Amino acid sequence: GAMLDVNFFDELRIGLATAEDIRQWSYGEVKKPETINYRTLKPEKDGLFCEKIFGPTRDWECYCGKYKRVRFKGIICERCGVEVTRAKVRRERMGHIELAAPVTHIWYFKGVPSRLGYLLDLAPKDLEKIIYFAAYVITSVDEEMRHNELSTLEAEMAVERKAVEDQRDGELEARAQKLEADLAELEAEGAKADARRKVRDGGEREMRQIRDRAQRELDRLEDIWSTFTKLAPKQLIVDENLYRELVDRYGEYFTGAMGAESIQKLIENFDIDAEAESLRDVIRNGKGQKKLRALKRLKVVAAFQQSGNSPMGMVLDAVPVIPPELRPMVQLDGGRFATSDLNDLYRRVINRNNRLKRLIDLGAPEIIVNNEKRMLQESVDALFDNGRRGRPVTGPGNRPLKSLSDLLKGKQGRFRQNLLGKRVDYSGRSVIVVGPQLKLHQCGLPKLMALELFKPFVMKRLVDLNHAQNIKSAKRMVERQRPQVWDVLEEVIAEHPVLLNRAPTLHRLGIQAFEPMLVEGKAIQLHPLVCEAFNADFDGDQMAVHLPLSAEAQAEARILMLSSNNILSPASGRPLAMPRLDMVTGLYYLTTEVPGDTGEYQPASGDHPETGVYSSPAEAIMAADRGVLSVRAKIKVRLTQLRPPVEIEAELFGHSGWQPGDAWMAETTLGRVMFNELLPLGYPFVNKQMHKKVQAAIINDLAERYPMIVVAQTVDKLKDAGFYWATRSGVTVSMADVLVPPRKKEILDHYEERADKVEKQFQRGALNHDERNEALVEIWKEATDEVGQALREHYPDDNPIITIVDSGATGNFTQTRTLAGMKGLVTNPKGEFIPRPVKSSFREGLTVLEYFINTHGARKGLADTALRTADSGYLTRRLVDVSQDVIVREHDCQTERGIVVELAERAPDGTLIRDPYIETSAYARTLGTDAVDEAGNVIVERGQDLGDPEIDALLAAGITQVKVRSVLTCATSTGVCATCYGRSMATGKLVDIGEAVGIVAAQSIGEPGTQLTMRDITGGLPRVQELFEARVPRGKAPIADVTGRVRLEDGERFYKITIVPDDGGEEVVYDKISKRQRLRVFKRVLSDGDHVEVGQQLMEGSADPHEVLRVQGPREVQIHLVREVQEVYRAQGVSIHDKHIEVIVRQMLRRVTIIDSGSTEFLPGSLIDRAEFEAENRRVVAEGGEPAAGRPVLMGITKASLATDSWLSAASFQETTRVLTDAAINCRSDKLNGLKENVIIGKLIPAGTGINRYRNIAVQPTEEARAAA
DNA sequence: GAGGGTATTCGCCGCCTACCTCTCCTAGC
DNA sequence: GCTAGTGGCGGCGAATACCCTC
RNA sequence: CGGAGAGGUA
Ligand SMILES: [Mg+2]
Ligand SMILES: [Zn+2]
Ligand SMILES: [Zn+2]
């Protein structure tokens, strides 16, 4: 189509290659297994590197050397024969090998299912025997001629059989006469009875040998006749002697062969139309296992019939040879070559082919030629796919060689290693340290790394400023780091954004852009407020630096990716660039009121006025400086630049407003005034202690009510203040600060008494081992709880450890109890708790037998963490692949469908109680219908963001359920619409028209997978994986399918649950339910004669998603999956909005399984996209309506990912070989419409700024501005 | 003998990202 | 220096090997 | 800088 490659690509088509195509690609034949000569280091003629085939190895030079100049361009030498051109041609030209005998392609013979087996209806064992010269096969037979000749051959064989058996009978009669002669011989004298019996035994055993000879000969002839009369094509005849007799006796009437030539002949004499008709007939009739087999056979046969591709491409008469530059051979230090693996395999193929050709030409017996053909077959199989059949062809070191099929597969294959990822220029790396002085949009960049990244710009500026005369002088000056380059570098790097990235890149904010500023040193200075987004600490981490070059790239880095523009988490909307650790401690210390402190407010005592009231915060600061006042002492202050709270403002000023400069008396501490002076001017005064949650709420309010620049400046100011006041907060660690509970011994003795009583009861006969273990795990659990409570009560409120934990900065109280109380219960290699506790704390020091088990547990945890981090990445990759083409495409589909969210179900006594999980279900959603209460007017209009004010108004009005728009019900053909998706969690506004929401959903789901532990029902990451893979749950719990009463039965190892429907049409029963599982409690436990719902879950466990779809419908399975995943994630304390899970679940429900094909071309049991199915049915009903009937189906992420319309995307994901062979057989054409495909071919992705409406903007000055010039 | 089921059994596919340092590379005539 | 060649495990689907009547 | 192996960092 487009020759080598030229822009305006339209499609990428694949198919089977014929021998004619292979010989057309070829520039010449390879017929010598010689790579390079050692005496001259030049390619050998007709070898794997021959220059007459693959082109010159030097620019405009010939092998002989007659022409060695650019003038002799395009002329083929008359002596050497190598065309004079550039040396890059060796990367493009291919050769070929002319095989002496036909060979099969291993992909279409050995790959399960064997496609040759389906095409020819031969079992894989028959193909194994025939292909590798182990059994003959009948290729043809002449029926009419053989029948007409049989009409006489029957009599002829009868005649010869009669002749043979009559000769045998004559021989036996002669033997009888000889027996009579022997009788006379032994009767001539006095013989022995035993001697008579011995001679009789000899005679009769010879006679029986004759009888057995007759029987065996007749069996041979009868078998030959039976084989011939019912002989048919595609029959294997082992026992070469039988086939030899068949051909000798009946040379004509048929043709038998062996090897790949026989398969080629069979494919030649094979009409596809008749086979397809027979398969379709067997499908429409018959039913059963035959129909099941015919379905697959027809799949392959229709694949070969619909297209204009012949099936004769499975047998190869020639082998292409890859260009030399793609399989180079290098030389080790000294001059010894390290040959590649491809060269060795090509060499073996060439050797075997040449020797086979020699034997064939010279003449040889059948056996040797067949052996050589088999070895050639095996050599070509090893070349194409090494190790698929038989032992791998190994090289030195007993390691299997690489094949052509290993260059495309795996984590190190072509796709995932070279096309989906690359190594790039203008990039560096070093260690990261902390720069507190930076701002949220700045980073410190080492001078030596900046000089190298910005080398061309510095050279250009050096030439411009007359420091060098040409570019070479400037380049040398930069290489030598002369003192004149730093001054120009300072100005060159000004306002040039730089991208920073830290691996692993779990979510979007792992890459962010900053404004570089040169620093002294070799480590990068990172802002403290981006560590959470990067997940970076400063114990040795390293980061990578990338430099955008073009104007568009700089614009993207400066607008889309700037660090100060990404404050909120895209997964949940919570702020990520907010104070933590030291900053939280400092702010918590500052904004704390300690009763009875210095300079505290004092009411009038009847002899002096009130004490502790100040006329301004400046006076309070002066008093604090003098040491008369404390920053944490309650006072009365007059404030004029701080806005009063809502209550004070309403009851003090009214209507008009605060109008900065109005004085009001505040009753707070000085630290709170200092904290409130760090917030925007119009923000109401906050009088509270700043726990981390209070700060998070403040930041969320600022983000949702102010522009992001104000938020960035506010977080910078809070960082400064927190770091300043954490130094003066007086938090340290000393063994005097680690207080021990004052009565640990008493509690331990009290519970040891209980343990002793239980142990003695066990010693007596009252309870078995398990009861004792459970009782001892209890008692000790309560002892640990009581010790923790005593420890908490003992500690003062201002202890550094208590302050750090309670401030929300970091840590929890379990660690505090372990450090100062007692560790408690440990776990056995199976996970169960040991009945013996660890009564020592790390302040006292564990003993040697309490340390051994502790180390056991710690190492077990570390290993589990490693396995979990390995397991989460695979799920993230699958999630990304399944939903990579879900992109916002419209603004509104104007659909009337939606979903209902509970939104604070009501109380029984009568009251509205807010649903706990409301921010991940109801917020950031658009209304689908107007909300009305008790026939009143609408409370919230259709198409409302439905934020906090809207939800509060809805709750006040007394309405619980509201219908909202969801992607599950979006009507857009491709992608989704902005209104259905709703608010963007990162931005806080309606999502844009180019936003790629599938990748965001995948990254949001997959990122918190390590926190979510991998803990007979699955309960963690395995549970999530089985939910997303649509597998059978494991502990499957049956669900009813028709409302009615139940006749529960009680028994051992089985329960009989019978559904007696209200209609009574039929009764369903479940009898295999093992007694291990309990019975679910719904509405009291399930009991006999109890009415149940249609979708009720009878037992206790996890219901499979496939039954709920078959019984209740798609919406029910959607809500089921969303609820299950959300609960699995909530159990660990992770908040993800439901829209991401909805995106994934939408991607999982997109196809329908066919039942009746009708006039349509869809085969039964095929998965067809719902839109395509509906379009085909609507087209068909117009003309001779015979519409197909289909049913909804649920597919896992892997199946939905591998059932794509692009063979390139599917091959770059998994199972490259199977996908490629199927695509080649079906002759699939790839329309390059997708993110991964455009990434592979190096084109602008169809999302974001690469969309047509954005990339085609036209810019021009206004007429007035143009005139003003 | 001949349709209807098997009914395990075996083979193939999958198993996180980024970086740094160092040693060795065929046997026989 | 040159020439030749008996320490992974789960999930899924096709395939033999096996009756089971019939 | 082609391949194999060993060790280490986050
Ligand atoms: Mg670290
Ligand atoms: Zn020449
Ligand atoms: Zn929509």
Curated annotation (Swiss-Prot):
Q: Where does Zn(2+) 2 bind?
A: C893, C970, C977, C980
Task: Give this protein's Gene Ontology molecular function annotations.
Answer: DNA binding; DNA-directed RNA polymerase activity; magnesium ion binding; zinc ion binding
Cofactor comment in the record?
Binds 1 Mg(2+) ion per subunit.
What are the annotated GO cellular component locations? cytosol; DNA-directed RNA polymerase complex; peptidoglycan-based cell wall; plasma membrane
Q: A single Pfam family, by name?
A: RNA_pol_Rpb1_5
Q: Which UniProt keywords apply?
A: DNA-directed RNA polymerase, Magnesium, Metal-binding, Nucleotidyltransferase, Transcription, Transferase, Zinc
Under the heading InterPro entries, the entry gives: DNA-dir_RpoC_beta_prime, DNA-dir_RpoC_beta_prime_bact, RNA_pol_asu, RNA_pol_N, RNA_pol_Rpb1_1, RNA_pol_Rpb1_3, RNA_pol_Rpb1_3_sf, RNA_pol_Rpb1_4
Q: What is its EC number?
A: 2.7.7.6
Q: What does this protein do?
A: DNA-dependent RNA polymerase catalyzes the transcription of DNA into RNA using the four ribonucleoside triphosphates as substrates.
Subunit comment: The RNAP catalytic core consists of 2 alpha, 1 beta, 1 beta' and 1 omega subunit. When a sigma factor is associated with the core the holoenzyme is formed, which can initiate transcription.
HAMAP family referenced in this protein's UniProt entry, alphabetically: RNApol_bact_RpoC (MF_01322)
The name of this protein is DNA-directed RNA polymerase subunit beta'
Q: Which organism is it from?
A: Mycobacterium tuberculosis (strain ATCC 25618 / H37Rv)
